[PDB]
Design a protein around this ligand. Structure first.
Ligand SMILES: *[C@@H]1O[C@H](CO)[C@@H](O)[C@H](O)[C@H]1NC(C)=O
Ligand SMILES: *[C@@H]1O[C@H](CO)[C@@H](O)[C@H](O)[C@H]1NC(C)=O
Ligand SMILES: *[C@@H]1O[C@H](CO)[C@@H](O)[C@H](O)[C@H]1NC(C)=O
Ligand SMILES: *[C@@H]1O[C@H](CO)[C@@H](O)[C@H](O)[C@H]1NC(C)=O
Ligand SMILES: *[C@@H]1O[C@H](CO)[C@@H](O)[C@H](O)[C@H]1NC(C)=O
Ligand SMILES: *[C@@H]1O[C@H](CO)[C@@H](O)[C@H](O)[C@H]1NC(C)=O
Lengths: 476, 91
């Protein structure tokens, strides 16, 4: 026999793959790319004013942030409809935008008494233990009174420099430009962004009723304690009113079928986890099954948790004069996409378990399997020198090059040098003598001396496997 | 053309769906005057598909032939610009 079981095991896998492919096709349309592109180009490409040539991406001073927040920002937000405000006469700006900042207090750090006679105040790096909570300025409204993270219904962000909190001093802008401009001018007249600020957030959302699909926007400007301006942005095309069309019902049915399939697989895996064999971890085709099941279970858990709580949208729809809070939904959508992509990638990789239909594929699979052990053995030795080079580059160049700034960047730039992409002219001025020595020795050693070992091992293993297979056939 | 959710149906008033043959307009608009404001069938308009970047546009639609010299071409274009000819429904 040995063929009736494999046929069922293959047809069920093909059905599951078809269902997953339909499901992943249904979630990735073509309008979202252009939607995001128009939003980004409207908000991140237009200059601050007609004379200045700096956009949001090239902010370089705290004065430039004030110049941007009145001008390009207000031009993008409020459009004179031929009251409400449609972004492109298509995208509706629902609610009102909100701006908030995080600041620290004076005397946070300690200047040495040797030079205390000239330095009066200091402000350390951002930290939860050393953030200001006292009122300042004219002291009327929420822009000058500290508000707890719990009352703001926010969460952390994990910015480039650090992980900011959700608290701070916030202010809800108006619904029309004539009042938002006045509010921003009032915030600028009194000193609201002094040396003590560390971050500033601007966020809003749009609907674009033509295609039922939201879009949340967040703009973050970071002020490090060492000076400078670090901008950031994020656009997320959410979708919260899913069940409108027939295709949406079809997608829901496909999701239910996928849940049934994953239940059947977990049942049939827990069935054979002990019956056919106990403690079978030497196959690598069953260690993949548990990964598939775990990833899919996590995906369904995230999906069922995210869509179960949409009370924010309803409570906004009761009264549309307040700021909608859609941060958590966007975060969970990003997490769900990240999980689903990996899940489908492993599902596609799983296909290798069945392509053994003839001698040509069987011998190739045998060659690939037999050469895994020594390749793994040599990979450790290769990566030891690779990480030694990475740490050398990080220590020597990791402060004046902008490309070796952190360890991950050193790893990635060495991988790119393996591809022969990165030029060497930006290292000699960083360091005159050790720069080109590093580049030359690294390319000399890793480029062919330690790189063709993989090819040699693979070639020798394949040749000897083929020779043995041919020899045993003739011996029989 | 599409359907608008009832939760915010009071806010949004009109829907202009993405282009599709089954959702094309075949009705007069504006100051109805022959070629420039009456839908013309593809068979009568001598046309064919194009396969643009977004979708495959048919050969039908509203059209207006220009003239032979600059002056009254500019006059016709100014006429088409005064009477708004590019609404939100254009695709
Ligand atoms: C913060 O406290 C220090 C310590 O006295 C003082 O010199 C400084 O002026 C204070 N900062 C502000 C903004 O008042
Ligand atoms: C703060 O409140 C006072 C008292 O009503 C008011 O006159 C003033 O305009 C408000 N704003 C500022 C910046 O003082
Ligand atoms: C935060 O708490 C709830 C959210 O569930 C809401 O009723 C309240 O208005 C929110 N406060 C602000 C300032 O957004
Ligand atoms: C579009 O149609 C709806 C009802 O079908 C109507 O309320 C609305 O006024 C129309 N808008 C235009 C611009 O014709
Ligand atoms: C439409 O045609 C009539 C017929 O002569 C003409 O009187 C009218 O001016 C035309 N409309 C416009 C906007 O020119
Ligand atoms: C369009 O094709 C028709 C054939 O049906 C032909 O009579 C006509 O000359 C062509 N051009 C015109 C008049 O639009």
């Amino acid at each position: 026999k040995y063929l009736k079981s494999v046929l069922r095991e293959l047809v069920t896998y093909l059905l599951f793959l078809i269902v997953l492919c339909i499901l992943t096709y249904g979630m990735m349309s073509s309008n979202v790319y252009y939607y995001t592109r128009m939003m980004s180009q409207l908000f991140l490409d237009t200059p601050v004013s007609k004379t200045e040539k700096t956009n949001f991406k090239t902010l370089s001073s705290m004065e430039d942030f004030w110049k941007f927040t009145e001008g390009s920002l207000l031009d993008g937000l409020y459009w004179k409809m031929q009251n409400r405000s449609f972004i492109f006469y298509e995208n509706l700006l629902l609610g009102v935008p909100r701006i908030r900042q995080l600041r620290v207090r004076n005397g946070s750090c300690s200047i040495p008494q040797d030079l205390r006679d000239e330095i009066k105040e200091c402000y350390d790096v951002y930290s939860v233990s050393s953030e200001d909570r006292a009122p300042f300025g004219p002291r009327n409204g929420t822009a000058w009174i500290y508000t707890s993270e719990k009352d703001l219904n926010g969460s952390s962000h994990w910015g480039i420099i650090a992980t900011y909190s959700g608290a701070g001093y916030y202010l809800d802008l108006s619904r029309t430009r004539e009042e938002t401009a006045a509010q921003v001018a009032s915030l600028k007249k009194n000193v609201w962004l002094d040396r003590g600020t560390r971050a500033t957030f601007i966020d809003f959302s749009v609907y674009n009723a033509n295609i039922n699909l939201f879009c949340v926007v967040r703009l973050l400007v970071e002020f490090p304690a060492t000076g400078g301006v670090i901008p950031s942005w994020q656009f997320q095309p959410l979708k919260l009113i899913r069940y409108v069309t027939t295709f949406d019902f079809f997608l829901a049915a496909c999701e239910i079928i996928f849940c049934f399939f994953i239940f059947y697989y977990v049942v049939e895996e827990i069935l054979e986890i002990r019956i056919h064999k106990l403690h079978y971890f030497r196959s690598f085709w069953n260690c993949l099954d548990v990964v598939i099941v775990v990833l899919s279970v996590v995906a369904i858990g995230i999906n069922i948790y995210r869509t179960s709580n949409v009370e924010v949208l309803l409570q906004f729809l009761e009264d549309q004069n307040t700021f909608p809070n859609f941060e958590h939904l966007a975060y969970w959508q990003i997490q769900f996409n990240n999980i689903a992509a990996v899940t489908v990638f492993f599902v596609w990789i799983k296909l290798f378990k069945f392509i053994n239909f003839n001698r040509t594929m069987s011998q190739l699979s045998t060659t690939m399997s037999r050469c895994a052990k020594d390749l793994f053995g040599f990979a450790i030795m290769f990566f030891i020198i690779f990480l030694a080079y990475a740490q050398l580059a990080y220590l020597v160049f990791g402060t004046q090059v902008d490309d070796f700034s952190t360890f991950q960047e050193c790893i990635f730039t060495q991988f790119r040098i393996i591809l022969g992409d990165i030029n060497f002219a930006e290292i000699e001025e960083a360091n005159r003598v050790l720069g080109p020595i590093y580049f030359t020795t690294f390319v000399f050693f890793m480029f062919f001396i330690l790189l063709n070992m993989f090819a040699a091992i693979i070639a020798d293993t394949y040749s000897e496997v083929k020779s043995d297979l041919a020899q045993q056939k003739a011996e029989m």
